[PDB]
């Protein structure tokens, strides 16, 4: 079935790039303030929608054995701290207290697919704000020694199609992905990976 999605997402990608290309050119021609607002709105919504489609095509290709993951050493904290800076600006528009907490024993550098891991953590953060209202969002980076070798744990607790794509990526990454929720503790999305 993975090649059926890739075929669909492909058919959907082509016209989308057609829309964006046209909006890109429109932004370059004389427009009134209102016209430009409309075109900029079409362009923003178009890019968000192309991004999702490309993520759907990306995962479909991965599951169809058509491409593979990247395995490179990479600064975990920098990645984490790049993702949090993307959501700092929204934590103060949405009166949210965004906190992070990397454990002591966590290594700074690890091996894996950085760009796709970035997609995952951003997906969990995106979910988190959309479920939160003037609460706290806590991203935790820790180690999970339960299960022989020590494993990295990344969790986001708060007080859904990109989240499905994120879960498939974690599975191809040889990890687990779980969901916690308690009346007092909020909801926690986590992802445990091999080191």
């Amino acid at each position: 079935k993975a090649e059926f999605l890739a075929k669909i997402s492909h058919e959907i990608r082509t016209p989308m790039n057609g829309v964006l290309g046209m909006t890109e050119l429109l932004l370059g021609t004389p427009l009134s303030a209102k016209q430009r607002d409309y075109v900029q709105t079409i362009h923003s919504a178009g890019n968000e929608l192309l991004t999702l489609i490309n993520e759907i095509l990306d995962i479909s290709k991965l599951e169809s054995g058509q491409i593979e993951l990247d395995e490179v050493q990479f600064d975990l904290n920098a990645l984490i701290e790049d993702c949090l800076d993307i959501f700092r600006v929204k934590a103060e528009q949405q009166r949210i207290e965004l906190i992070s907490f990397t454990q002591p024993q966590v290594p700074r550098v690890i091996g894996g697919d950085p760009t796709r891991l970035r997609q995952v953590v951003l997906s969990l953060l995106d979910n988190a704000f959309k479920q939160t209202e003037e609460g706290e969002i806590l991203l935790v980076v820790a180690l999970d020694d339960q299960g022989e070798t020590p494993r990295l744990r990344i969790a986001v607790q708060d007080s859904h199609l990109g989240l499905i794509i994120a879960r498939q990526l974690v599975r191809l990454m040889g990890g687990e992905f779980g969901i916690q929720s308690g009346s007092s503790q909020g909801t926690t999305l986590s992802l445990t990976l091999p080191l």
């Binding site: 057609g18 829309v19 046209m22 050119l25 079409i42």
Partner: protein, 60 residues
């Protein structure tokens, strides 16, 4: 399949917005090339809305 339906709805809502703003622009004062540039957006977005309509029946 619920994913295809979710994927269709996830795409449809921005897509009707695209068409909505595209329509609004078409009503405004624009040059032929701009209007022509808009007609391509409409055509592409409408075609895209035709595909996700298939997908939403395909899920059924």
């Amino acid at each position: 399949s619920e994913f295809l339906a979710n994927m269709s709805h996830e795409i449809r809502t921005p897509l009707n917005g695209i068409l909505g703003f595209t329509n609004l622009l078409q009503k405004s004062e624009l040059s032929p090339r701009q209007q022509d540039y808009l007609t391509t957006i409409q055509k592409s977005a409408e075609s895209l809305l035709g595909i996700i309509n298939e997908i939403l029946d395909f899920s059924k």
